[PDB]
Design a protein around this ligand. Sequence first.
Ligand SMILES: [Cl-]
Length: 321
Amino acid sequence: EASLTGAGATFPAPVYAKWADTYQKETGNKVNYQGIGSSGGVKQIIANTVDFGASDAPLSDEKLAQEGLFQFPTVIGGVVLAVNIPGLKSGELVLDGKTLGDIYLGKIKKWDDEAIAKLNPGLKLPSQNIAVVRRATGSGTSFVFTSYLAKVNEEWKNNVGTGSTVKWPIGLGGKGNDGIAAFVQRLPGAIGYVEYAYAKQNNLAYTKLISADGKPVSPTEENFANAAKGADWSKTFAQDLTNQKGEDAWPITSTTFILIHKDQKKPEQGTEVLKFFDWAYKTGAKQANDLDYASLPDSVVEQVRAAWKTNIKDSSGKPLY
Ligand SMILES: [Cl-]
């Protein structure tokens, strides 16, 4: 029986927590996961204060080598826009990239604006003020969201850019994916970006979006998976899943990563960390789908196992997988 600690991204916390609970019920091993945001996860693993870190933003090959870290992907999720709009039911409103960016730039202030009406011919939109919400500190969800905005709105790209943190043009700060969810729920007229599970599990309304190919698409497990169908995983785990071509490709999709040290000074802990994740790939797919996270293809989990044998070892150089 092992006692393990992980910390980082809130984007996948719902599935890591469920995996952890089930794993304990079946093997007795205990995994404690702290959802503190991707930046804190990177800082904590580098500081050796946790057995494993978690970040939705991938570290470059050079940064990994500099810190003696190894990175591997777990699941595929999707970022959606949770909204609190009077009269409209969930999934009713459609936004495109350009207009979404204009809302986040503060150019569009009301829900019945001409640009939103044009995208929604049949809807009776309210004259409600839009209340924009965003993340309070360094966030992996913010990284994928701003990575998307920079591709579809040039003004955003040139003045604000992409990052785990950016100089937000407008918007109240919410802490964690759960904080943005709670803000949307209490604020009539609100719009906030969150990983899908955070909107669905809290019964929040969300919008549809226009794919890179120009078609309206709904956010679903299958549609997040579709956005990764063209990913050449064999080249690198650090795949960009925003604004991808293809039928029913959710435009704001992303995978997420686990970081661990290659030279394990507590080899028993590392050995157990790998067993937890392997068990998850082997048996946890139903738990991931129940939460609407798409599973990585078997080919990718095989890449991860092969890489574990080659990179994770004790101080004498013995492989831990
Ligand atoms: Cl936060």
